[PDB]
A paper describes a structure:
NITs are attractive biocatalysts for the synthesis of amides and carboxylic acids for use in the manufacture of drugs and fine chemicals. We recently discovered that substrate specificity in plant NITs is related to the structure of the NIT helical assembly. The helical twist (Δϕ) of the NIT filament is correlated with the size of the preferred substrate: NIT4 enzymes have a relatively large helical twist, small substrate size, and high specificity, while NIT1 enzymes have a smaller twist and broader specificity.
AtNIT4 is a left-handed helical tube with 4.9 sunbunits (dimers) in one helical turn, a pitch of 8.62 nm, an outer diameter of ~13 nm, and a ~2 nm hollow core. There are two diad axes, which are related to one another by a −5° (negative value: left-handed by convention) rotation and 4.31 nm translation along the helical axis. The extended C-terminal tail of each monomer forms two ß-strands, which assemble, along with strands from monomers across the A- and C-interfaces, into a row of 4-stranded ß-sheets in the interior of the tubular filament. Interactions across the helical groove (D- or F-interfaces) were not observed and this could explain the plasticity of NIT helical twist. The substrate-binding pocket is a ~7 × 4 Å tunnel lying close to the C-interface that runs almost perpendicular to the helical axis. Crucially, we observed via molecular dynamics, that this loop is held in position by a charge–charge interaction between R95 and D317. On this basis we refer to the loop as a lid, R95 as a lock, and the flexible ends of the loop as a hinge, which open or close, shifting the lid relative to C197.
Author numbering:
A (entry chain J), B (entry chain I), C (entry chain K), D (entry chain L): 35 to 251, 276 to 347
The structure:
Amino acid sequence: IVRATVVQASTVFYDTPATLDKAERLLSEAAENGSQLVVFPEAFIGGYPRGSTFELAIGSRTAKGRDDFRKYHASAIDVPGPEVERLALMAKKYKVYLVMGVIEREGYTLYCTVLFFDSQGLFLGKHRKLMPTALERCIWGFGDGSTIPVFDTPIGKIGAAICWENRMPSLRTAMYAKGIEIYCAPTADSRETWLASMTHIALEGGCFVLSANQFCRVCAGGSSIISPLGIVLAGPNYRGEALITADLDLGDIARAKFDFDVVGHYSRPEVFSLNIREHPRKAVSFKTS
Amino acid sequence: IVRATVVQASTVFYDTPATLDKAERLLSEAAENGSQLVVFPEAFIGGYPRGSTFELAIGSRTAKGRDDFRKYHASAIDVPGPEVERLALMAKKYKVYLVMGVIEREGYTLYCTVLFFDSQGLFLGKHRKLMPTALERCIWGFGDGSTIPVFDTPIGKIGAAICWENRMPSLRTAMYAKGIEIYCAPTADSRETWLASMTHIALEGGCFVLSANQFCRVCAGGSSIISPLGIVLAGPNYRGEALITADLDLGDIARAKFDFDVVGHYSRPEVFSLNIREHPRKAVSFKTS
Amino acid sequence: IVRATVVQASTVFYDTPATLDKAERLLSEAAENGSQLVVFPEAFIGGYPRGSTFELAIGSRTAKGRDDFRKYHASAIDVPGPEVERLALMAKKYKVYLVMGVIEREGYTLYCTVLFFDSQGLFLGKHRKLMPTALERCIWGFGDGSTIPVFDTPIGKIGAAICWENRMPSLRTAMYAKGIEIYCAPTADSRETWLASMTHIALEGGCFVLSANQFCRVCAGGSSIISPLGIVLAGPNYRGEALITADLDLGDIARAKFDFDVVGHYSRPEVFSLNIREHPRKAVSFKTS
Amino acid sequence: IVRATVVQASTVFYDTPATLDKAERLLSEAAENGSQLVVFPEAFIGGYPRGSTFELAIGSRTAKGRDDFRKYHASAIDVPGPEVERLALMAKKYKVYLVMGVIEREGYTLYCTVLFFDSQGLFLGKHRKLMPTALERCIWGFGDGSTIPVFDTPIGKIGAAICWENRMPSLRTAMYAKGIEIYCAPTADSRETWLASMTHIALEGGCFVLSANQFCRVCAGGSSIISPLGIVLAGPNYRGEALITADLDLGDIARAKFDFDVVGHYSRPEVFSLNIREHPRKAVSFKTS
C-alpha cells in the first residue's frame, strides 16, 4: 500500500528560476504527510501560452509573432544541464518519486516532455509528446516511438501520457502490454468530458489513473484519482489550488482483472495483432573512427 | 438529418413465438411518430438467462443443470429460416431500418448474434459476438474475424458491437477504419459506469453512440443517445420502459473531426500499425466435383 | 525542342464544378498557339483559404471554426472519381501533357496534392505534400515517402514539388538522383525572394524551373521560367493574369552539366551518403483469403 | 550584437612576404571602427592564377607549363611554420577574430585551405577544399571528410565553405546540423548568379551569410552580407576595393526559425537520413613502439 499526491498549482509564466522554488516549497509541503509519489501538471516549468494566437493568418507572419516566439523560446530548459541537477538534488533530499512536466529545447525547437526521477536522485528517462493537438503544432515538435518508457520501481510500474495522447487507442494498448499499473496523465483542459474520459481508461486497463491539471487566473482545472474499479478516491477540485492525496492498495488490481483482462485472455490473438516500430530516428548521423 | 429511436423493452423469456408480437405492438408505436431507424436490446428474442447458475461447481455437473440447459436451447431460432422471414416482411411494409438482437442455434451450439435489415425487407448480414464475458463462456460460443460488418446505407454507415466488446481497443479501431458514423451498441449491464464508457467512444470516434438496454422485473436499464461532441440528447431513462427518440444531424460529424480525426491525421503510421485476419475458419470442409 | 506554357489564373473559391470550366476556357486559349505542356497553380480546384484564421486561440475552438471548416471540406474532390475523368477526357481530345494542382479528400482529411496526365488521356500518378507549412498543419495532412514520382515521358522527365518543399535539400537531392530535367513547381507565395530561390535550383540542377502562382483580388503572383544557365526566358509577370510561354531547348542541359553535375562527378560518395525509406505506411491493414 | 567586416583587396601575386603586410595594414584599418570579426577572400596569400592555361592540350605537356608550375609552387606556405606564427601574433595584438584564405603545401602538393584564429592568437583549425571546380583539378588537391569544423566562440558559431562547395546540397546539411549561425563563404567569381545564390542559403539556413570576393586589374568582385530574413545589409560593392561593415543582431535567428526549421521540425526523419564518414584517411602510416 502506497500513497500519492497530485498538485494543482500554476506557474509564473516567465523567469523560470522563480517558478523553480514553488516546486521546492510544495514538494516540502507534500513531504510532511508521508507522501511517496508526487505528480506535477503539463508544462509546469516552461509555461503554457494560453490565449495567445501569435498573429497567424494563413501566411501573413507579422513582426508581432516573432518577438513573442523568441520571448517564449528564451524561457525553456534543456536536458541534461543545470536545471535537472537541481531537481535531482530536490528529490534526493528525502524519499520521494517525482514526475514533472517541463518544456525542453534542442537547437531552436521546442518539445513538451515529462521527466522521471527516483528516490536516490537519479534521472530515469523522459517522454516527448507524440503529436500536439491543434495550434501547438505551429510551436512544438513531434516525438517518435523510441521514447515510451516502462520504469519498474519498488512501488509499482509507473508510466505517463500527455493531454490528448490519452485518446489514441493504439498507444494505450502499447502501454498496457508492458505492464502499467500506475498511469500518470497530466493535461491542460478542464471539461466534463475529461472526468468521464479517465474512468474509461481506469476500467479498460486495471490501473490507478492519477491525473493533474493546473488552476490559474482561464481553465479552472480539476485533478483527481480513480480506483481500478471506477471509483473516485479524491474528487474533482474545481475550487482553488490545493494538494490532493489518497492511498493506493496495490492488491486492488489482481481482483479487478478477474472479470476483464485486455492483452491477456481477451484481445483474441488469432484475429488481431498490433506491432510497434521503436527506432531512434534522426536526420543527420556522424560516424568517426 | 435523420431521426432514430431506441427501445427499452423486455422479453417474455419463454415460448419465443409470443415475444415476436411484442416486436410489432411496440414497433408500430415506435414508427407512428415518423421514425427511420429502430434499435432493439441484447438477447431480445432468445432471452438472457439472469440469475441462473446452472449448478456448476468446478465440474460436478448435477442433473439440475442439464434440463435447465435443454429448456434454454429449445427456445432459440436459426438463420435463415421461418423467423427471419417474419422480420423481413415486418420491416418491408412501412419503411424502417431494423437492427435486432437475437440468439441463434447451429447444431447444438448457441451464438449471441445481431441482425441487420434494410427498408425494402432484405437481409444484409449478421455479427456474432467475439468473446462472451465470464459465465456466458459456458453457454455461448466464440466468433471469428470474418463477421464484422459496416453496411453502407443511404442514411449513413451502421455497425454494431455487443456488451463488453466495446472495451476492446483493437476492435474499435478496426470499426473506425471503415468509417462508422452510427455506432449501435446493445448491452445487458446497467451501472453508473456504462454512460461514462459510451461518452468516451462518442468523443474518440466522431460517431453517434446509440445504445439500448432492457428493463424487466434486475435490469434497471438506462439507454441513451450521445452526440459526437459528448452531449446527451435523450437521457438515461432509468424509470420504467419507454420509446426514446432524437434527431441525428449528420453534418455534425465533419465539424467534430476538425480537431481529432483518428486514423489520419492523428494516428502515426510511422510507429503504429494494426492488422486484421479476416478469414472464414471452420473445422470440417467438404469438397466435391 | 519542346515548348511549355504556365498559367496565372485564379479560382472561384466555392462551388467547385464552376471552377472546372475556367480550366477549359483558359486551356484551349493556352493550347491554340501550339503548346505541348501546361502547368496550373497550387490548389486551383479546391481553393487556398487566404486570410482565414478559423478562430483558433490555443485550443479554445469556438463555434465559428467548425462551420468554416465543414464548408471548406465540402468543396474537395476525390481520386479516382467523376472529377478526374473530366480532366482525362479534357487532355485526351487534343494533345497536351497536363499537370494540375488539386485538393483531395480521403474520409474527412484533406491532402494538398498534384496530378499528372499524359497526352492519350491516362492517369500517371499523384504526389501528396510532405509537410504543410505553418497554419496549414491544422487543416492539411502529412505525406509519406512512397509518393515522389518522375514519370519518364517522350518529351523528357517531369517531377514536381510544392511551395516550401523546395527548401528541403534532401528532397531536392532525391529528385535529382532520378534524372529530373523539367522541374515543375507550383506555389502560393509571391515575394521578391522566391525568384532568387528558384534561380539557385535551376543552377544547382540542370533542369528547367517552370513555376506557377495564382493572381486574385492578395496574391500579386509572379510566375516565370528559368533556363539551366540561370537566365529568365519569360519574366515575372506581376501585372494581371495571363498566359506565359517560352521554348525549352533540351540540348541546353548536356552542355550545362559540363561544369557542375551533381551526384557524379561532383558528389563525393566516399564521405556523404543519403538514403530514402520509400514504404507505403498505413494505419490499419485488412487481409483475407 | 556583434559587428563584422569583409575586405575586397587583391594580392601582389608573387613575393608572398610583400602581401603579408597588406593584411597587417588593412587589419589595423579595420581595428579603428571597433570591428570584431574580419574575413579575407579565397587564395589571399598564395595567389589565384587567373587567365593561365599552363599549355595543356590532352597530353602534350610542353616545357612552358612546367616552369610556370614551379614558379607557382615556390610561392605557397605550409602550416604550421613561420607564416602562421606571424598571423597569430597579428591577431593577438588586439581583440579580433581572423579567418583567412591561404594556399598551403604538403610535400609537392597544393591545397586550397582556410585558417581560423581566435582573439588570443591561438590556431583553431583549418578546412581544405572538398573538390576543386574545373581546371583547378589539375593543380590543387582533394580534401576529405575529417576537416569540416564546428568552432563555437563567445560571439557565435563560425564555419566556412569555399567557392562552389556552396552548391553541394549534402555538405550544407552537414554544416546546418552542427549549428552554424555565422556562415563565411569566400569565393572567386563575380556574376549575377552569386548574389541570388547566397540569399537562398541565408533563407534555407537561418544564418548570417558573410561573403568576400577580391577586386583586381578581370573579376570585379562584389562582396556582401545578408540577414537571415533575406535582406542585404551591406550591398554588392562592384566599384573598387574597400572595407565593408555592418552589425549582426544575434536575436534575429530565433525569430527567423519560427516559420521554417531545417534539421529540426522539417526534414522528416522517417523518410530521409544522411550520414557522414569522417575518418582521417592517409596513404602511408608508420607506427612505432
